[PDB]
Design a protein around this nucleic acid. Structure first.
Ligand SMILES: Nc1ncnc2c1ncn2[C@@H]1O[C@H](COP(=O)(O)OP(=O)(O)NP(=O)(O)O)[C@@H](O)[C@H]1O
Lengths: 138, 138
DNA sequence: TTTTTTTTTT
């Protein structure tokens, strides 16, 4: 169950359903994005699809990247995978990565500090709010 | 707006912080007795020094962000008439003409006029400004 | 309030 701007989105069964009516699901966190059914004829959808095609040339690579990023919607246990993306610079890396976090909102997505991944763990017990950002986020 | 001064001899420029402070994207930090939070990075950066920074990287992601300019004129006492790039200094400029409200608001008006000029000439894109000197020096 | 954090130490 995923909270959206115009109700709550249920992805338990395909196709996904939007709950615009009264319900008793205990849901508090949400994103400001208003969910709409996928439509390839929407001008913004066309623009985004063309941008995705431009950023990632290979078809198989594009499909795998879109499949991996789509798992961000689900907030439960998932495959032990991480994606490492290398680029010379000014090649659209941060555009797509930040757009995913923008559309998920702060309650479900967050930028993480690089020192959280390439530095030694703090000695014994010390408070670590950077690691605490990982709670409840997809 | 944010500016840096007080640079030591031959300091090494941390390019990891460079990619993080000049970037149209979110950044993550923490204040005393406060939790983690993220905010958009929106500051114009200027650095002043008497020594060249040491840059130890050559990736396009770094050098696409940097611009370098060298000062030609010098302000002192008894300027050499044979040096066009040497001038008589006026202490008031820093002792008085930086604290007077009138010159401050005149400079603010100049900045607003130049912003309007940039908007109406290049659609707000600073990259489109033609300047051989900055490009050559960089 | 009061404590923990920060500070301080590693
Ligand atoms: N599909 C696209 N078509 C055209 N321009 C694009 C497209 N996607 C992104 N850009 C632009 O390309 C530039 C680079 O985007 P950005 O995501 O910030 O770079 P990056 O690959 O993360 N680079 P860097 O962080 O500097 O190593 C920006 O000016 C974007 O607006």
């Amino acid at each position: 169950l995923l909270g959206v701007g115009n109700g709550v989105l249920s992805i338990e069964t395909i196709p996904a359903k939007l709950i615009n009516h009264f319900h008793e699901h205990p849901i508090h966190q949400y994103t400001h994005i208003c969910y709409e059914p996928f439509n390839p004829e929407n001008p913004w959808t066309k623009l985004l699809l063309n941008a995705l095609q431009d950023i990632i040339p290979e078809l198989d690579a594009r499909l795998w990247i879109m499949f991996y990023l789509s798992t961000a919607i689900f907030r439960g246990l998932k495959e032990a995978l991480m994606l490492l993306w290398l680029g010379g610079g000014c090649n659209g890396k941060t555009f797509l990565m930040r757009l995913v976090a923008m559309v998920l909102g702060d309650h479900y997505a967050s930028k993480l500090n690089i020192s959280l991944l390439t530095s030694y763990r703090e000695t014994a017990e010390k408070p670590n709010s950077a690691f605490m950002r990982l709670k409840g986020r997809g | 707006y944010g500016y840096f001064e007080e640079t030591n001899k031959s300091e090494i420029l941390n390019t990891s912080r460079l990619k993080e402070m000049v970037n149209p994207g979110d950044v993550t930090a923490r204040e005393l007795n406060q939790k983690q939070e993220s905010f958009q990075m929106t500051a114009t950066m200027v650095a002043a020094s008497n020594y060249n920074f040491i840059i130890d990287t050559t990736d396009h992601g770094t050098w696409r962000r940097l611009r370098h300019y060298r000062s030609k004129v010098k302000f002192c006492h008894n300027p050499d008439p044979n040096n066009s790039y040497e001038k008589k200094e006026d202490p008031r400029f820093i002792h008085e003409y930086i604290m007077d409200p009138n010159c401050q608001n005149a400079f603010f008006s100049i900045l607003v006029y130049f912003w309007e000029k940039l908007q109406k000439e290049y659609n707000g894109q600073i990259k489109k400004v033609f300047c051989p000197t900055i490009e050559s020096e960089t």
